[PDB]
Structure 1
Amino acid sequence: KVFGRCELAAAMKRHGLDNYRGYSLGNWVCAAKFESNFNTQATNRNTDGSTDYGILQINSRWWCNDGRTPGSRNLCNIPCSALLSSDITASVNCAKKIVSDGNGMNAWVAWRNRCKGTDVQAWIRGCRL
């Protein structure tokens, strides 16, 4: 599913991402924009053989099981395919664990390089939330 911008903002808010670990909703929408272009089916293979999945490009090296990342962890205790669903629940619950790790939203490279320090509130401007 390719979410609309406000459609994704509302779903992320309903699932409790807004201000989760102090990161306003605009930060999460911006991250999803540059990680996946709001496409839940986005995937990208990393050089080490792990794969990033879904709207927030969550990595199988640590966070989900895809059966093809030897020696990896599954810290969100989910199949990586659950991160590709039209329903973002699994991606949100797993992102809450990731952002709780030492480096906050810097875990998302596209957030650090394209969202951090910018006017992130613009990503939710015009939305009815």
Structure 2
Amino acid sequence: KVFERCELARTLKRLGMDGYRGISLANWMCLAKWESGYNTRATNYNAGDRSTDYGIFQINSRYWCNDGKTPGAVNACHLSCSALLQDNIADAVACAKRVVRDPQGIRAWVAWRNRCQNRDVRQYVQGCGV
């Protein structure tokens, strides 16, 4: 599914993302925008290290979810990567919460550093009722 901006903002809020580990909803929205364009079906294969990024938050198969075909996988979310390609994002959200429980927090995603950090991100949630 491709979410509309404010539909995703309200969904994330209901799923407990606002302020999770200190991360505002706008920061989560900026992450999702730049990782996938709000698209749950997004996948990106990294030929260099043989891992794949899955779903709306582009969660990687070396450290977080298991796809069976990535060398040196850890499966820290204890989830099949296929769960991150569903239209329902509850499993993706649970795994993203797990990612940010590590010290780096949302900096785990490079796209957040490039596109979101130290920038005005209020635009992503304006007018959404959140």
| TM-score calculated relative to the size of structure 2 | 0.97
Query: Which amino acid is 1:78 matched to?
Result: L
Deviation of the 1:117 alpha carbon: 1.1
| Runs of 4+ residues deviating >3 angstroms | none
Secondary structure of 1:29's match? helix
Q: Which amino acid aligns with 2:41?
A: Q
- Matched residue, 1:34: 34
Letter in 2 for 1:123: Y
Gaps of 5+ in 2: none
Secondary structure of the equivalent of 1:3? coil
Task: Tell me the residue number matched to 2:114.
Answer: 113
- Other structure's SS at 2:20 match: coil
- The aligned amino acid for 2:80 is P
The residue aligned with 2:69 is 68
Other-structure match for 1:9: 9
AA matched with 1:5: R
TM-score by length of 1: 0.97
* Deviation sequence 1:60-104 (CA, Å, 0-9, x none): 001101010022111101100100111010110000010111211
Question: Any idea what SS the aligned residue of 2:64 has?
Answer: coil
RMSD: 0.7
Q: Please give the alpha-carbon distance, in whole angstroms, between the structure 2 residues aligned to 1:84 and 1:112.
A: 24
Query: What's the % identity of the aligned pairs?
Result: 60
Task: Provide the C-alpha distance between the structure 2 equivalents of 1:104 and 1:66, rounded to a whole number of angstroms.
Answer: 23
